[PDB]
Design a protein around this nucleic acid. Structure first.
Lengths: 97, 60, 85, 43, 72
RNA sequence: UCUGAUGGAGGAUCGAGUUGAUACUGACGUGCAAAUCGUUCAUUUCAAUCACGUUUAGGGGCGAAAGACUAAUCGAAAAG
RNA sequence: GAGAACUUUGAAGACUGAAGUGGAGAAGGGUUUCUUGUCAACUGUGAUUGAACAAGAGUUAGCCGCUCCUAAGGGAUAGCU
RNA sequence: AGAUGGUAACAUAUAUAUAAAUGAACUCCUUUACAUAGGCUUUACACUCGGGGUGCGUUUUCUUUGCACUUUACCUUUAUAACAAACCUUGGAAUCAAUUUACUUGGAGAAGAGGUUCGUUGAACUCAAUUCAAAAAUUUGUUUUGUAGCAAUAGUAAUUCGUAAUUAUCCGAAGUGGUAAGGACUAUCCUUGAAAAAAGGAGGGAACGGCUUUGUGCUUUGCUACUCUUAAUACUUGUAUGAGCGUACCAACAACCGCAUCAGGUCUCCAAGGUUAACAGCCUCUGGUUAAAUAGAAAAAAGUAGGUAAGGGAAGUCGGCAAAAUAGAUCCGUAACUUCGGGAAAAGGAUUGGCUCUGAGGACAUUAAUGUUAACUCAGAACUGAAACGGACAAGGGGA
C-alpha cells in the first residue's frame, strides 16, 4: 500500500527541501519498535515534489503526519505549516488561513 | 456589556459559558451582535471561538 | 461442621432475651418451620404460609391448621371422637 | 408555583397591573405600591 | 414508516388515490443505491433498490401526476 | 459425634449519608442565628427516616410520660 | 464611564470536585424572566452593577399535567335528637 | 343460520389497514392489583481497552505519541434470533437421576428427543430481497445489497468555495460492573403487605335469507345469486374532530419561611476520572465560580482557630476536662466469665514501598495430542533505599 505526502507548495516556496524530509523518514519510522529496520517490508521512495511510503505491514497513516510535524517543528517551520489529508492515501503541506 | 453575547454564544455552540472566547480587541462588533443569527455569523467569521476542553490525559 | 452446640436456630437471636425464653421459642419454631405430610398427595411438602394456613408445595392445596404445627392434639382428638360414630 | 389555577393567575395579573405608577399627564394636576420581595400579597 | 419488498405491492400502493408524493433518495454505497418512498396518509412505504437500472425503470413507470421529491 | 465447604438469619456489628445532640460546660452570647457555628459524639433493615393528604381543638386534644407538645404562646393555647 | 478593588473583555493563579453555588421539578413566591434605557433612594465599602427604578415584551399541547377513578377521609340527603 | 388447521400444548384474516371467525338475558373469572430480605442471572445505559480515519497539541530531548469526534429517537402486532420459565407429544426412571450459587424436581410420569406459549428484549440471527447450484405440476445450500424501514436528507468532527454552496468520515473488535429494569428463585412474619374507574376472556344459547303474493307477525304459492367487516364518496342531519385551565422565572447561592439580599430551615431525580472496600476523604474532566454588609498597610499586647516543644509523665484538677496515644489490611495469638449465642477488633505480636521475576486460579478446534485468547486476585523470591513504606487522606486506646 502506497502513501503519498506532497510538498509541492512548500518546496516551490523553497522554505523546505525534499532530501532532508526523505532522509528523516528513512531513519525515523520505527517498525517493531526499532528505528532502522525498514528493509523489504517498509520502503520510502523518491520524488522531486512528493514523498512516497510503500508499506507491507499494518501501518497507520497518522504516523506520516506525526513525523512531518516533528520535522517542521525541529526546523522552526511548524508555525506556518499544516499537514492536511488530501485523499484516502495522501497528505499535503498547507499554509495557514 | 457582553453578557448577552456570552449567553447566546454558549447556547449556539452547545458548550459552557466559561468555554467561549471573544476576541479581546474588536469587541464593538460583538456588542453589535444581539441575536443567535448574528452570533452564528460572526463565530463563523471567527470572533467567538470555543476554547478547547482542558486536557485530561489517561497515560499515567 | 456443627456450628452451634445447642442454641440451634435460635442462634439468630444472639445473647438477647433469656436462655429459657430462647429455648422455649426454639422448641416451637422447630415445628413451625418443619415440613408436614400432605395427606392429599402423600408428599412431605406442606409448609406454613401464615399463622394458621398450611400449603402443600405439590398439591398447591392449603388447609387450616395450628399456629405452629399442621395439627393440634385438641383438634385431632375431636376429629377422632366425631369419626368414631 | 408553575402550576396555578385560573382565578389565582388572574389575581396575580391584576396585582401586577395595580403596581404601575401614576401617569405623568395625570400628575399635571402613588402610595398603594408594593414590591414582590418586601410585602407579600398573601393572596 | 414501513418497508416493502414486493415490487407488485409497491406499484399497487402507488396507484392508489391516497398516495401523494414519491421520495427518491440516491447515495453512494462503496455503485449508487437508491430508495423509493411513497407517502400515503397512513404510512411512508420505502423500497431499497441496489441496482440503478431497475430503480430508473420503476421511477419512469411510476404514475406521473403524483409529485416527485428528490432528496439529494 | 467430629471436620471442611456451602448458605445468608438477626429489633447483629463498624460506618458515610439521613435522623439527632454526648462533651468541650469551646466559639458566639449588642450573635450569622430570639438556639447558630466548630470539633467531638449517637444513629443507619428497622419500635427505621421523609413528603403530601387526612383525623383528633382548649378544662379539650395528643403524650414509649418530660406537666411534654398543641404555630417563638401551655401546671389550661390564641382572638375578641 | 465624570468617577472602576467588587461592571465588561482577554491573560494568569485557583475553587466548586458529580453527596456540585451543575442540570431538572414540588411547596412557597408572583413577573423577580427578556430586551432597551437608567441611578433619587436601596444594593450596610464603592458601583457605570442589580432580583432597584422606567418603557415595552414574553408563557402556544388531542399525546406533559389537571380534568376521570377510588383511599385515609370530608360534606350533604332520609330519618332521629 | 354463524371459517379453518395441529395428536396436543396451540395456531390461522398481512386487505394501503391481521377489519370481520353470529351470538341476547343471566352468571363466573382475569387484568387493573400491590410487603420485605437475600443472592444468581439477562439487557440497556455508564465507564474503560485496542485497531482504522480526521483534526489539534508536545516536540532542548523522548514519544508509531496525548486529546477530541467517529452518533442514530419514537413508531413498524417491528419481523426474527436468543434466553429464564411453564405446558404438549414421545419416552418409562434405584446402581436413582436431572440440576442450582443456594435448593429444587420426578410413576400425580424424571432423564433423553421433538415441539407450543408467554415474558424479556428490539435487526440479534443470513433478518429481508437478490445471484448461483440441488428438489416438481414450489423446497435446500452459495454471493451481493441495506446502518432492516425510520436514516442521513438529520447530527458530529473536518477540508474548501461568492459570502449561501461543495467534498470526505461517521467502522473492526473486547473488558469492568456503577446505575436501572426484568426474570427465575429462596427466605421472613402472633406483620400476609388498598380500592375503584376502565378493559378482557368465558359459560349459556334468546333472534334469524332476499323479491312477490293469499288469508288473520303468522301458513301459503312463483324465482334466487345474499349477510357481515373495513375504507372512500354523496345527501340529510344545527355548524359531523381533538374542549377548558396551567406552561415565563427562582427554588435559595440574594427570588420561599425566619422583621433582611439572615452562616438557619426547606421534599424529589440525574451522578464522570484517579487512589480506594467505598456514592468516604483528597485531587481532577464536563458544567459552574473566582462571590460573599468593605478594602489597603502594619503586624505588638490580648482574643480566637490551630501547630511544635528538652527532661519528667497526671505531681494539674472536683474529675485526665482538653489533647495525645494505633487506628487500614494480611498472618499469628486471644483470658476471666457466660444465658454457650458471646466476651472478641479481648489482651498482645509481626508484616506492609519500589523494581525484576516465579507459581496458581479460565474460555475457545482439530485429528490421546497442537494452537488463539481474557480478568485482576492470591502466594513466594531476589534486588533496592538515610530501616521507609495503611508515608498524604482515612482510621478503635486498652485492661481490672
Amino acid at each position: 500500500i502506497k502513501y503519498v505526502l506532497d510538498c509541492t507548495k512548500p518546496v516551490k516556496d523553497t522554505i523546505l527541501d525534499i532530501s532532508g524530509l526523505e532522509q528523516f523518514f528513512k531513519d525515523k519510522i520505527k517498525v517493531d519498535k526499532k528505528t532502522n529496520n525498514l528493509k523489504n517490508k517498509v520502503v520510502v521512495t523518491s520524488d522531486e515534489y512528493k514523498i512516497y511510503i510503500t508499506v507491507h505491514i499494518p501501518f497507520s497513516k497518522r504516523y506520516i503526519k506525526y513525523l512531518a510535524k516533528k520535522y517542521i517543528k525541529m526546523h522552526q517551520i511548524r508555525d506556518f505549516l499544516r499537514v492536511i489529508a488530501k485523499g484516502k492515501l495522501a497528505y499535503e503541506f498547507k499554509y495557514f488561513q | 456589556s457582553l453578557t448577552l453575547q456570552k449567553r447566546l454564544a454558549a447556547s449556539v455552540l452547545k458548550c459552557g459559558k466559561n468555554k467561549i472566547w471573544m476576541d479581546p480587541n474588536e469587541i464593538s462588533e460583538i456588542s453589535l451582535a444581539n441575536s443567535r443569527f448574528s452570533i452564528r455569523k460572526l463565530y463563523k467569521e471567527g470572533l467567538i471561538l470555543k476554547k478547547p476542553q482542558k486536557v485530561h490525559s489517561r497515560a499515567r | 461442621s456443627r456450628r452451634t452446640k445447642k442454641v440451634g436456630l435460635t442462634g439468630k437471636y444472639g445473647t438477647r432475651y433469656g436462655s429459657s425464653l430462647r429455648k422455649q421459642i426454639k422448641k416451637i419454631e422447630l415445628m413451625q418451620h418443619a415440613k408436614y405430610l400432605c395427606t392429599f398427595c402423600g408428599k412431605t411438602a406442606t409448609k406454613r404460609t401464615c399463622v394458621g394456613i398450611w400449603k402443600c408445595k405439590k398439591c398447591k392445596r392449603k388447609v387450616c391448621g395450628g399456629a405452629w404445627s399442621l395439627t393440634t392434639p385438641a383438634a385431632v382428638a375431636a376429629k377422632s371422637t366425631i369419626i368414631r360414630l | 408555583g408553575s402550576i396555578k389555577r385560573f382565578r389565582l393567575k388572574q389575581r396575580l395579573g391584576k396585582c401586577r397591573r395595580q403596581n404601575r405608577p401614576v401617569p405623568h399627564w395625570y400628575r399635571l394636576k402613588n402610595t398603594k405600591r408594593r414590591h414582590w420581595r418586601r410585602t407579600k400579597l398573601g393572596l | 414508516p414501513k418497508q416493502i419488498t414486493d415490487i407488485r405491492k409497491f406499484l399497487k400502493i402507488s396507484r392508489k388515490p391516497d398516495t401523494t408524493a414519491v421520495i427518491i433518495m440516491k447515495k453512494k454505497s462503496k455503485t449508487v443505491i437508491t430508495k423509493l418512498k411513497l407517502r400515503t396518509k397512513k404510512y411512508l412505504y420505502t423500497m431499497v433498490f441496489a441496482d440503478r437500472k431497475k430503480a430508473e425503470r420503476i421511477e419512469n413507470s411510476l404514475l406521473p401526476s403524483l409529485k416527485r421529491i428528490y432528496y439529494p
